[PDB]
Amino acid sequence: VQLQQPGAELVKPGASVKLSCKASGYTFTSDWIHWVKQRPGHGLEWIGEIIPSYGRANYNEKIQKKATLTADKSSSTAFMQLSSLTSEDSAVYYCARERGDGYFAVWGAGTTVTVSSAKTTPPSVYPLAPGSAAQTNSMVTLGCLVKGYFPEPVTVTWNSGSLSSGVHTFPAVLQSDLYTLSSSVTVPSSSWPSETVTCNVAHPASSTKVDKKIVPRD
Amino acid sequence: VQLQQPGAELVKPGASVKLSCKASGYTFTSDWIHWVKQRPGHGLEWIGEIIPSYGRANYNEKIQKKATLTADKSSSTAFMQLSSLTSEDSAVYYCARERGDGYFAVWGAGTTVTVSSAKTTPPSVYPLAPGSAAQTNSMVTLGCLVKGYFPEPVTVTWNSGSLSSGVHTFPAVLQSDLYTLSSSVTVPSSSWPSETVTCNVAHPASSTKVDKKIVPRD
Amino acid sequence: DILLTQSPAILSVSPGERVSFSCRASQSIGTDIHWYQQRTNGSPRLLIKYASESISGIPSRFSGSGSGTDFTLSINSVESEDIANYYCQQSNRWPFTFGSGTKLEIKRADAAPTVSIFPPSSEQLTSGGASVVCFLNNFYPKDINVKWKIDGSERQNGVLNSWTDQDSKDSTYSMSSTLTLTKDEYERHNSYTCEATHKTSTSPIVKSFNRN
Amino acid sequence: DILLTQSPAILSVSPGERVSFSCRASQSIGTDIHWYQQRTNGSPRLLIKYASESISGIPSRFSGSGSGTDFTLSINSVESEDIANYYCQQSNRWPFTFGSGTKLEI
Amino acid sequence: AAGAATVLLVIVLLAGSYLAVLAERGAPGAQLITYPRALWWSVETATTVGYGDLYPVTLWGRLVAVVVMVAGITSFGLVTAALATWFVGREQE
Amino acid sequence: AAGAATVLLVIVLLAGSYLAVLAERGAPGAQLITYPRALWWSVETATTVGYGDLYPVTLWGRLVAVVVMVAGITSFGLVTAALATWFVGREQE
Ligand SMILES: [Ba+2]
Ligand SMILES: [K+]
């Protein structure tokens, strides 16, 4: 992972927040670091660029200039100070590494920011094995239910990524200041429960990760 | 004939094909060879150019880059390798000789390409002398019928070109994977049959050429 | 990719009269436009180079004007040997590009078809087929209606007509009509007729032959 | 602020077939346009750089044409792993700018 | 000297290419904002070719630009004094 | 020498005109893609006139372009050293 930045931050309105981006790999003199903002269901909004070795930074003219860019030359990490936030400011924030030749070769995985006065809740994960009487096809479908978490997002994985064959993770729904989503995996009815199948639910905004094995109904 | 290239090629789908262009005349250092593609009932699509003395070639950006251009410096012939063809690729393919000053001074007669799994059939030529009872005007009309050939095209000539006075060759019709066309010539009823009148039917895709003299009905 | 735009797509004109094709480019290209004529069945033929300059071997009729984005080929008088497609071509930026092309058509005096009917050659029957071919030749306008009859009974079936593009010795059209049957079927019918209803004669032009 | 305009906004296509996205710029930008793919939940991914040049690790399906104000990304055959959003991005004048994006549907 | 003026040019061409990008980014409209074409620009400038496809718009851009002219034009009005002596003498012999 | 620097220029002007076309074709947008204007371009370049109607866009185009400047500007800063001596001396007599 060439550009590597936190998963999610939660901010009260009016507050500030500082976003990181550690950048393994090469740490060239001429490298610039940019910051692109993707509001939900929108495209990419450039925001600002910084050359960390030399110091100077440049911000998007045409947006309310909230942020201020900083760098740490000996740590290969660069920062972005969003200040006095509203809800219009909740989005994913990518850093990119532009060599100096004008394209973003490399992109951090992006930091989901949520500005709300609400509280940080970890999620509650429940398995979803099929009924004790649903007739078994060649494939069997099963999933797990992540309920009542805040803020977004949650990473959902199956056997911690080893089983990526036929997964859907559904989008979260909102309700009274908590979220709910579900994931779904499909395996050969031969191989299960002959092979054990676990769903793993990281929630970055609370720094919690959990596992659950979808056993048959005991 | 300054640029001189084969008449017709037949290609099974998915196959490749290599197209030639021998170029008598001058063989300048700076000469470029281009390749323009004319789909039926369409205009001219440039495709690529090559400077044969020096080697390098350049292809049309915006078309699926199927072809690759080559040259033979000591033989004054240049090649074009169309690769993995569909039916969208059946057209006439001209080479042109561009001096270096940006116009196509000289154009090869062009190579008709047909991509179909069908078989190569030579044509069957029958004369068309008038009825034993059609009243003879000052001019007399007569022709010949080229039937059931594949692929396109056929060159139709009258007294091997010597009589080009009042000829129409009609467009081929298609039917169950063979073609049919007709030509028509008109001569003074004085001069015929006092002068003998023959129609000559080259078919390049099979390397067959035939003659037929339109005698009166014997 | 500089975009060369030739409007109109087709051009009528009565003969002997000046005619102009416009080629407008998506940006200024100076004078690096060049015109090509391409007739039916032939390859294209450089007509004018660099907008204004002339090619040796080309009629003095052809003249080329224009610069920047607006360009024009012209024919100070037309004749029927000019019926063709006309392309422009820009050499000012890479890649070289071509215009969509304009076809020249000629309004001329109306002309009535020369009908000719042709019985299947003795050579053709010696297999298992016999096609009666009928030539409508040198009429104008191109809209003409061919009708077949066997013994007076209109046969609508097994009929392949073929139309020439506008010929370039006289500005007229022409049309063939193959009549596909079998040797078997051709023998048990006596008469075959070819009927052409065309704009010139309210009386339809007929041609018929009998085997007997 | 050079204005990059990607129309259409969405693109249907039956699979295996060529597909082209147009990015037209509010002025000539030479060839300093670059394309990014961004799938659901993932970050964007440089596809083509400087209109024509290709990126190592990218399928040969992807091809980039164009210069001046009119630009095009193309996929000589489609498969279901290409469903994503596609952005253009100009590096010819400051500030760098992004296209509105096109979603590919099958 | 022999190839000494040559080197000092190439310091100025790079150095200048680099600061050009640094100065010109942030100025809405600048053409001169990637390191590659910054480098070609500073040759365009030291040789006074004048194609005029790139130039600076900011104040510090023009400042860099003047250093390149001065430092490069003196370089080049000394690198070209020297391709003129060695090569003319080689062809004189 | 007398007309020796002159010749070497004309090698560079042609040679350069030629490679210019070779390098620049294939680059979508290049203006510099027929041998005639390639030749005028390389005079525009060796004399640093700077009308700026033609220039290169590809990398190898710029490379050729730099050879023409170096080789031509040294040519010309020696062909013009010589139209300046012979003709000024002729008019001095
Ligand atoms: Ba100057
Ligand atoms: K200039």
**Given an 8 Å threshold on Cβ–Cβ distance, is E25 in contact with D94?**
yes
Cα separation, B4 vs B107, in Å, equals 8
Which of C1, C4, C94 to mutate to test binding with chain D, by most D CBs within 10 Å of its CB?
A: C1
At E12, is the secondary structure helix, strand, or coil?
A: helix
Who among E40, E48, E84 is closest to F74 (CB)? Answer: E84
Burial class (CB in 10 A: 0-12, 13-18, 19+), C14: exposed
**Given an 8 Å threshold on Cβ–Cβ distance, is F24 in contact with C93?**
no
Residue D34, min C-alpha distance to chain E (Å): 14
Q: Does an H or E element contain C87, and which?
A: strand C85-90
Query: How many domains is chain F built from?
Result: 1
Angle C183-C188-C193 from CA coordinates, rounded to 5°: 90
**Given an 8 Å threshold on Cβ–Cβ distance, is C99 in contact with B173?**
no
**Given an 8 Å threshold on Cβ–Cβ distance, is E33 in contact with A102?**
yes
**Given an 8 Å threshold on Cβ–Cβ distance, is E31 in contact with D93?**
yes
Instruction: Note the residue count of chain A.
Output: 218
Nearest residue in B to D67, CA atom: B61
**Given an 8 Å threshold on Cβ–Cβ distance, is A102 in contact with D46?**
no
Cα separation, E46 vs E23, in Å, equals 18
Per 3-state DSSP, chain C is made up of helix, strand and coil in percentages (nearest 5) of 5, 45, 45
Q: Does an H or E element contain C46, and which?
A: strand C45-49
Count CB atoms within 10 A of the CB of residue C168.
Answer: 17
Query: How many domains is chain C built from?
Result: 2
Which of F48, F51, F67, F80 to mutate to test binding with chain E, by most E CBs within 10 Å of its CB?
A: F48
Tokens for A178, please give them.
């908590």
| D54 in contact with B, Cβ within 8 Å | no
**Residue F38 C-alpha to ligand 1 middle, in angstroms?**
19
Who among C87, C89, C121 is closest to B127 (CB)? Answer: C121
A191 φ, ψ (degrees, to nearest 5): -70, -10
Query: How many domains is chain A built from?
Result: 2
Eight-state DSSP code of residue A84: S
Alpha carbon E57 to its chain centroid, in Å, reads 17
Nearest to E41 by CA among E22, E20, E58: E20
**Residues 6 or more apart whose Cβ sits within 8 Å of residue C199:** C110, C141, C143, C144
Looking at the fold, whether C52 and C131 belong to one and the same domain comes out as no
- Taking contacts as CB-CB distances below 8 angstroms, the residues of chain B near F18 are 30
Label each residue of A10-43 as H, E or C: EECCCCCEEECCECCCCCCCCCEEEEEEECCCCC
**Given an 8 Å threshold on Cβ–Cβ distance, is B131 in contact with C209?**
yes
Tokens for B57, please give them.
């070639």
Q: Which ligand has the nearest atom to the CA of F55?
A: 2
Count CB atoms within 10 A of the CB of residue E55.
Answer: 17
Cα separation, C102 vs B43, in Å, equals 10
**Residue E59 C-alpha to ligand 1 middle, in angstroms?**
22
Looking at the fold, whether A110 and A143 belong to one and the same domain comes out as no
Which residues of A sit within 8 Å Cβ distance of D?
34, 36, 43-46, 49, 58, 60-62, 94, 101-105, 107-110
Tokens 């007929």 correspond to C206
**Residue D9 C-alpha to ligand 2 middle, in angstroms?**
40
Residue E23, min C-alpha distance to chain F (Å): 23
Pseudo-torsion of CA E84, E87, E90, E92, nearest 10°? -40
**Residues 6 or more apart whose Cβ sits within 8 Å of residue F80:** none
Asked whether the beta carbons of B31 and B100 are under 8 A apart, the reply is yes
Nearest to C133 by CA among C145, C142, C144, C146: C146
Cα separation, B154 vs B157, in Å, equals 10
**At residue A203, what is the residue type?**
H
Which of D48, D67, D70 to mutate to test binding with chain F, by most F CBs within 10 Å of its CB?
A: D67
DSSP-H helix ranges across chain C: 122-125, 183-187
Domain that holds residue C176: 114-210
Who among D34, D45, D95 is closest to A61 (CB)? Answer: D95
Count CB atoms within 10 A of the CB of residue B113.
Answer: 23
Count CB atoms within 10 A of the CB of residue C86.
Answer: 24
Residue D67, min C-alpha distance to chain A (Å): 16
**At residue B157, what is the residue type?**
T
Angle B84-B87-B92 from CA coordinates, rounded to 5°: 95
Eight-state DSSP code of residue E13: H
- Report the CATH number that the domain containing residue B184 is assigned in CATH: 2.60.40.10
Residue D77, min C-alpha distance to chain E (Å): 34
Looking at the fold, whether B97 and B152 belong to one and the same domain comes out as no
**Residues 6 or more apart whose Cβ sits within 8 Å of residue B190:** none
Tokens 């990607």 correspond to D6
Looking at the fold, whether A107 and A61 belong to one and the same domain comes out as yes
**Given an 8 Å threshold on Cβ–Cβ distance, is D95 in contact with A108?**
no
Pseudo-torsion of CA C7, C8, C10, C15, nearest 10°? -110
Looking at B50, B82, B115, the residue that finishes a domain is B115
- Report the CATH number that the domain containing residue D19 is assigned in CATH: 2.60.40.10
Which of D67, D71, D74 to mutate to test binding with chain C, by most C CBs within 10 Å of its CB?
A: D67
Eight-state DSSP code of residue A150: B
Asked whether the beta carbons of B132 and B27 are under 8 A apart, the reply is no
**Given an 8 Å threshold on Cβ–Cβ distance, is C27 in contact with D68?**
yes
Cα separation, B178 vs C147, in Å, equals 25
- Report the CATH number that the domain containing residue F71 is assigned in CATH: 1.10.287.70
**At residue C7, what is the residue type?**
S
- Taking contacts as CB-CB distances below 8 angstroms, the residues of chain B near F21 are 100
Looking at the fold, whether B157 and B194 belong to one and the same domain comes out as yes
Looking at the fold, whether B35 and B74 belong to one and the same domain comes out as yes
At B7, is the secondary structure helix, strand, or coil?
A: coil
Nearest to D27 by CA among D3, D5, D8: D3
**B–D touching, 3+ CB–CB pairs within 8 Å:** yes
| B53 in contact with F, Cβ within 8 Å | no
Strand partners, E19: none
Looking at the fold, whether C84 and C138 belong to one and the same domain comes out as no
Domain that holds residue A109: 8-115
**Given an 8 Å threshold on Cβ–Cβ distance, is D93 in contact with E33?**
yes
Nearest residue in D to F28, CA atom: D67
Cα separation, F32 vs A60, in Å, equals 36
- Taking contacts as CB-CB distances below 8 angstroms, the residues of chain C near D66 are 1
Q: Detail the DSSP E strand segments found in E1-93.
A: none
Residue F55, min C-alpha distance to chain C (Å): 12
**Residues 6 or more apart whose Cβ sits within 8 Å of residue F86:** none
E38 φ, ψ (degrees, to nearest 5): -50, -40
Domain that holds residue F66: 1-93
Eight-state DSSP code of residue B170: P
**Given an 8 Å threshold on Cβ–Cβ distance, is B65 in contact with D72?**
no
Between positions 58 and 77 of F, the ones with CB within 8 A of E are 62, 65-66, 69-71, 73-74, 77
Instruction: Note the residue count of chain E.
Output: 93
Residue B107, min C-alpha distance to chain C (Å): 7
**Given an 8 Å threshold on Cβ–Cβ distance, is D66 in contact with C27?**
no
Looking at B91, B115, B139, the residue that finishes a domain is B115
Burial class (CB in 10 A: 0-12, 13-18, 19+), F80: exposed
Tokens 């000996």 correspond to A74
**Residues 6 or more apart whose Cβ sits within 8 Å of residue B186:** B139, B140, B141, B142, B165, B166, B167, C137
Count CB atoms within 10 A of the CB of residue D51.
Answer: 25
Tokens for A26, please give them.
């090469």
Nearest residue in D to E27, CA atom: D94
Eight-state DSSP code of residue C117: E
Looking at the fold, whether B169 and B198 belong to one and the same domain comes out as yes
Q: Could you tell me which chains touch chain F, where touching means 3 or more CB pairs under 8 A?
A: B, C, D, E
Between positions 9 and 38 of C, the ones with CB within 8 A of B are 32, 34, 36
| F84 in contact with E, Cβ within 8 Å | no
**Given an 8 Å threshold on Cβ–Cβ distance, is A100 in contact with E34?**
yes
Looking at the fold, whether B70 and B140 belong to one and the same domain comes out as no
**Residue E69 C-alpha to ligand 1 middle, in angstroms?**
11
Asked whether the beta carbons of F64 and F20 are under 8 A apart, the reply is yes
Residue D15, min C-alpha distance to chain E (Å): 39
**Residues 6 or more apart whose Cβ sits within 8 Å of residue E18:** A30, E35, E38
**Given an 8 Å threshold on Cβ–Cβ distance, is E52 in contact with F48?**
no
Count CB atoms within 10 A of the CB of residue F10.
Answer: 13
**Is position A3 within any domain?**
no
Looking at the fold, whether A42 and A94 belong to one and the same domain comes out as yes
Q: Which ligand has the nearest atom to the CA of E52?
A: 2
Nearest to B80 by CA among B100, B58, B61: B58
